[PDB]
Amino acid sequence: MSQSTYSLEQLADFLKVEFQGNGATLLSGVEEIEEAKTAHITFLDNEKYAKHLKSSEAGAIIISRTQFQKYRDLNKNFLITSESPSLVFQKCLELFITPVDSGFPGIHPTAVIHPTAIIEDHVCIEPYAVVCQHAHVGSACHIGSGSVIGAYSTVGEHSYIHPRVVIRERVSIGKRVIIQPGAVIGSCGFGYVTSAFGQHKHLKHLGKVIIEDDVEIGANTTIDRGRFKHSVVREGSKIDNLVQIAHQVEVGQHSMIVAQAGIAGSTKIGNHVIIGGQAGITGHICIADHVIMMAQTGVTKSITSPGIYGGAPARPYQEIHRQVAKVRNLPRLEERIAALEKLVQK
Amino acid sequence: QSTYSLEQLADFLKVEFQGNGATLLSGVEEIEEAKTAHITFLDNEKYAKHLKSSEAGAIIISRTQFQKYRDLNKNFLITSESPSLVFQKCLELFITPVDSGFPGIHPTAVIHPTAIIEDHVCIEPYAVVCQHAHVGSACHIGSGSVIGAYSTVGEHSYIHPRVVIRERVSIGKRVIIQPGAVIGSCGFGYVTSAFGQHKHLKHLGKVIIEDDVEIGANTTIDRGRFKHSVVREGSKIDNLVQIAHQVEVGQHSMIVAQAGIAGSTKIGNHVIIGGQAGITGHICIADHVIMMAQTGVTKSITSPGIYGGAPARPYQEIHRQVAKVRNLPRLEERIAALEKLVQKLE
Amino acid sequence: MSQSTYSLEQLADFLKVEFQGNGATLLSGVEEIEEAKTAHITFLDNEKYAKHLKSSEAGAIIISRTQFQKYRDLNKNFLITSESPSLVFQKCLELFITPVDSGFPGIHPTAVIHPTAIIEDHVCIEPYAVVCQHAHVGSACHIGSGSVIGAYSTVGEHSYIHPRVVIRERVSIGKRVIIQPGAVIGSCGFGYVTSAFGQHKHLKHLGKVIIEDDVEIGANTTIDRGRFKHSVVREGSKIDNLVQIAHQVEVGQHSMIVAQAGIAGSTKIGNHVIIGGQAGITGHICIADHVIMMAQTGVTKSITSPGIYGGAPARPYQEIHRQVAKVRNLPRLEERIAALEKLVQ
Numbered sequence A: 001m002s003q004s005t006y007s008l009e010q011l012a013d014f015l016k017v018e019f020q021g022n023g024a025t026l027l028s029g030v031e032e033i034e035e036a037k038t039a040h041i042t043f044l045d046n047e048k049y050a051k052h053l054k055s056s057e058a059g060a061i062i063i064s065r066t067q068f069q070k071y072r073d074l075n076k077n078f079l080i081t082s083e084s085p086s087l088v089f090q091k092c093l094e095l096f097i098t099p100v101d102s103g104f105p106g107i108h109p110t111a112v113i114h115p116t117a118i119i120e121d122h123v124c125i126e127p128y129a130v131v132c133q134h135a136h137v138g139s140a141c142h143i144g145s146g147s148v149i150g151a152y153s154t155v156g157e158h159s160y161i162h163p164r165v166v167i168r169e170r171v172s173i174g175k176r177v178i179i180q181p182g183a184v185i186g187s188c189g190f191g192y193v194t195s196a197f198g199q200h201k202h203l204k205h206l207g208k209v210i211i212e213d214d215v216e217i218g219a220n221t222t223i224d225r226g227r228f229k230h231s232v233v234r235e236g237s238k239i240d241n242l243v244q245i246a247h248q249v250e251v252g253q254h255s256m257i258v259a260q261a262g263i264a265g266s267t268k269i270g271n272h273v274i275i276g277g278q279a280g281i282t283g284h285i286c287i288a289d290h291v292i293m294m295a296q297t298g299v300t301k302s303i304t305s306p307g308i309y310g311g312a313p314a315r316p317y318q319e320i321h322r323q324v325a326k327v328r329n330l331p332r333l334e335e336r337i338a339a340l341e342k343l344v345q346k
Numbered sequence B: 001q002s003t004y005s006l007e008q009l010a011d012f013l014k015v016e017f018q019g020n021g022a023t024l025l026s027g028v029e030e031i032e033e034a035k036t037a038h039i040t041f042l043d044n045e046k047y048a049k050h051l052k053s054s055e056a057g058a059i060i061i062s063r064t065q066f067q068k069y070r071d072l073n074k075n076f077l078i079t080s081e082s083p084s085l086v087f088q089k090c091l092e093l094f095i096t097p098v099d100s101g102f103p104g105i106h107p108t109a110v111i112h113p114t115a116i117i118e119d120h121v122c123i124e125p126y127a128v129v130c131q132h133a134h135v136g137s138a139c140h141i142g143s144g145s146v147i148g149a150y151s152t153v154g155e156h157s158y159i160h161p162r163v164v165i166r167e168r169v170s171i172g173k174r175v176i177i178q179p180g181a182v183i184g185s186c187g188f189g190y191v192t193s194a195f196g197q198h199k200h201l202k203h204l205g206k207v208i209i210e211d212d213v214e215i216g217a218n219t220t221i222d223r224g225r226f227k228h229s230v231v232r233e234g235s236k237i238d239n240l241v242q243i244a245h246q247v248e249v250g251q252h253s254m255i256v257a258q259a260g261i262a263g264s265t266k267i268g269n270h271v272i273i274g275g276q277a278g279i280t281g282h283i284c285i286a287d288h289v290i291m292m293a294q295t296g297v298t299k300s301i302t303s304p305g306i307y308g309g310a311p312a313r314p315y316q317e318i319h320r321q322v323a324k325v326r327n328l329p330r331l332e333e334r335i336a337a338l339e340k341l342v343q344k345l346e
Numbered sequence C: 001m002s003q004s005t006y007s008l009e010q011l012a013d014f015l016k017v018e019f020q021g022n023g024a025t026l027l028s029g030v031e032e033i034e035e036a037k038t039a040h041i042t043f044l045d046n047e048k049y050a051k052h053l054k055s056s057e058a059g060a061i062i063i064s065r066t067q068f069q070k071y072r073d074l075n076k077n078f079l080i081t082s083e084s085p086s087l088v089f090q091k092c093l094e095l096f097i098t099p100v101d102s103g104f105p106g107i108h109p110t111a112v113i114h115p116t117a118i119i120e121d122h123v124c125i126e127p128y129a130v131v132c133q134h135a136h137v138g139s140a141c142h143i144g145s146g147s148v149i150g151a152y153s154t155v156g157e158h159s160y161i162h163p164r165v166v167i168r169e170r171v172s173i174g175k176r177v178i179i180q181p182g183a184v185i186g187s188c189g190f191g192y193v194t195s196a197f198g199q200h201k202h203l204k205h206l207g208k209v210i211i212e213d214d215v216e217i218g219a220n221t222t223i224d225r226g227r228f229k230h231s232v233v234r235e236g237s238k239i240d241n242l243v244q245i246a247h248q249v250e251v252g253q254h255s256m257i258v259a260q261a262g263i264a265g266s267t268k269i270g271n272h273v274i275i276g277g278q279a280g281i282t283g284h285i286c287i288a289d290h291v292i293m294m295a296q297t298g299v300t301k302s303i304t305s306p307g308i309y310g311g312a313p314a315r316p317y318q319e320i321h322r323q324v325a326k327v328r329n330l331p332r333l334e335e336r337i338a339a340l341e342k343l344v345q
């Protein structure tokens, strides 16, 4: 059974949103548009859902103003918003599954905080978390169970650090950053001096890592500091689980890096970039703004222009689509040769 | 340390032997490396090289492979069961397992007043059990592990140190979780805005880990927005694997290390995923499908059998295409052999 | 707070190095060769750069004696060394940026140490680290916050273990070994016996993990133990972030494994081997000494002689470079066929 029941109108009012349809319609859960039934709230998200909308049995559909002007004649209950539909849907989702926390509010007796560390107002620090010398945790932060905030590291207001995250020394974490469990920020970069015919001597890496506002970093993802320059991750970028970011990597604004991709040292990535799952980018190159790399891409040279790329080495997608096809067509090209090899006349 | 004779072993294992029964054995070893004091085993068409000239004092072997080598004057232990399983029986005679030496519930374990901890459970130093969690009987919760809000761990499960189990996770019976794993990380899903900017969505689905599942070190399993992610019973998952939001892994399936499945993909029962393979989201993998290491699965696999390559094709077809790509200089030379016969002048 | 400025001459005296140029030149930081300004010390270690040298604006360039001869005519401030310019550069770096510890000296009161664990002199153990029955921490070792040192595991003198590393039971860690946060040393190997109905039997692992001296291991890298014999990483090898080292893998000496690479069971890597980022190596094979594997390599067969290998399946550099070129050429190739086929024989 469900947690709550709402009428269309009651919910529209709660959401400070407009509605069209039957205000007395009863709503008791959420569902994706292709599976929603009378009782369900759903949303339309701007894709080929034309016929997904007409055939929708949902009791309430969250739709933007522009999209509603186009489907005004349809006999459906709409919740009409100026915000993005998915975001308003999120608000409806949390009426049915309320978000929950660990049950340890404020600073826990077992939190270890260095006397020189500065903790601001209204912060939560969970069991066994460690805050090292001269660190600075901004107001309304959450430091999860057993996380380490390293020496001289700053954490901007409203950031949410999950359990067992390690933030090493000299790391700048911006406002409203979300780090999932098991991330390591400011691990030493993979750089050495070579000696005695190939033996490798450790170099101390003294660069920072700068994590700007509204950045998210996924579970077990590792971000290496530069040797003397900073690794940076700019505003609004999101980074999925299990990603390697190497020393002195720059990742521009509102970029996205999907699980298990890796970027080698000293590479810059532009703004509005998508790096697909398991892709890899060599060191010492650049990726332009608005580039999209397909999963499992291997980037060997700089990309200087926007568009989709894939393969290894990466090529513009038109080129590798062609490549895969010509390769698959090899036997048919060989029978084409053998037939033309048969013609050996006088 | 103890010692066993060939007859003294055959009788314990309840197995038939052949050779010198008074032979003295004192350990296990790999077929190539085993001397007189060593028990070994054969379980390959591709390890037969090392049998003809082995020095083991006992060779565990199947009724099938025995038919090839019974003429050889080696000491055998012949089984109608898995040679490797019987091998394990011998190995567990010579090496004992060892624990931390922190029995029961440690004084430093933080258990929220509203959590339920059953009987005969071990919770190691600095582990944190959050509100309304249920830890079943005969469980082991490793040092510094987190058991999130409203999460349950079925009886006889084993959570290694520094594992993070987040909110509303269901861990089934006799599950083993290796160190560093993160169960119930947030799925990589965002709301894109007017200016290409990405808005965080709290993911509120469950992760359901069924009975007998094992999960490797530093592996990450994401939860769906509101629908569930599932790893069905029997499935074994290796190190450094990404399991994305709302993925469903069928029963008795294997996912090898560094492999990755993208959001909303369903994997059938008895599927093997070779290492470093990635599979795209929103597709289906049929039961009994085997993906080779480094496979790149772009489209749903409808039929069972072995697949490999990127894009994924059946074994026979990629093996073929690898051969035909290798043969391109030959193919071009026979075009040069043909562009030379333009000697057709008049 | 090292807002510090030194003179080129002071620098040279500190470093014990010859200089060419204005000794009064004021240096107040470090920079990479193509960005260095008059306030900046930089270095040239690779001839791969050197094109940035002629135009360089650095207030000092750390250079070798050979390179000086090559570039003598030039009007630059040089610090001339018989050592590695990158190792001399490091001494300058450390002059402007000072390493910082956590500020938790010695053994922190909240460290759990089993009555049967052995702790030597001058050891740091940080808040909430856990040391199990019969473990051994060497002299002058650092055990970072919340790290676990498992049952009967030894950590050799002068090792540095960062926060939340899990060192499991029966792991030997050598001298001077560094382990970045989150690595897991001694997880169970991935070993099973699939039954007729399709179900998979867990095989208990009781072998060990041996990490030799001067080895380094990256963040969240995971090194599994063997069914009955040890996984081993030999002297001076450096393993990057997020790597899979399976059960019974042996890594030789002075080898390097770049991030996300992976190696399957019972595989042998020789000495002075480089495995590139994201590369993958099957089980039960060997890689010869002095082999270089390109990034994203898929090695399916043993490499038995030295050199450079790339692609998936891996081939020597020559065969793989040629293959890419020939695949790249298929439209041009069938174009030659398209021209041929319009014969009227």
Ligand SMILES: CC(=O)N[C@H]1[C@@H](OP(=O)(O)OP(=O)(O)OC[C@H]2O[C@@H](n3ccc(=O)[nH]c3=O)[C@H](O)[C@@H]2O)O[C@H](CO)[C@@H](O)[C@@H]1O
Pocket: A189, A190, A191, A192, A193, A227, A248, A264, A265, A266, A267, A282, A283, A284, C031, C032, C033, C034, C042, C043, C044, C045, C046, C049
């Ligand atoms: C993959 C990648 O991107 N770089 C690799 C390469 O870097 P490489 O040796 O080229 O230089 P690194 O990036 O390691 O050194 C740090 C910085 O020094 C600067 N610099 C380098 C040489 C020089 O003569 N003058 C100078 O100013 C470079 O711009 C670099 O950003 O070999 C190192 C040897 O272990 C690895 O750590 C690095 O991962």
Ligand SMILES: CCCCCCCCCCCCCCCC(=O)O
Pocket: A190, A244, A246, A247, A262, A263, A264, A265, A279, A280, A281, A282, A283, A297, A298, A299, A300, A312, A313, C240, C258, C259, C260, C276, C277, C278, C294, C295, C296
């Ligand atoms: C140049 C080799 C050809 C194949 C294409 C390879 C693309 C590069 C993949 C490297 C993975 C990046 C991992 C980061 C490692 C690090 O630098 O610390």
Ligand SMILES: CCCCCCCCCCCCCCCC(=O)O
Pocket: A240, A258, A259, A260, A276, A277, A278, A294, A295, A296, B188, B222, B242, B243, B244, B245, B260, B261, B262, B263, B277, B278, B279, B280, B295, B296, B297, B298, B310
């Ligand atoms: C169309 C894709 C081209 C290549 C095919 C390779 C399959 C993709 C591999 C990606 C694996 C990573 C999945 C995690 C995704 C996530 O968490 O959002």
Ligand SMILES: CCCCCCCCCCCCCCCC(=O)O
Pocket: B238, B256, B257, B258, B274, B275, B276, B292, B293, B294, B308, B309, C190, C244, C245, C246, C247, C262, C263, C264, C265, C279, C280, C281, C282, C297, C298, C299, C300, C312, C313
């Ligand atoms: C066509 C041949 C397949 C492609 C080549 C892939 C080479 C192997 C890549 C996977 C590495 C396996 C490491 C996983 C460790 C483990 O088994 O636990």
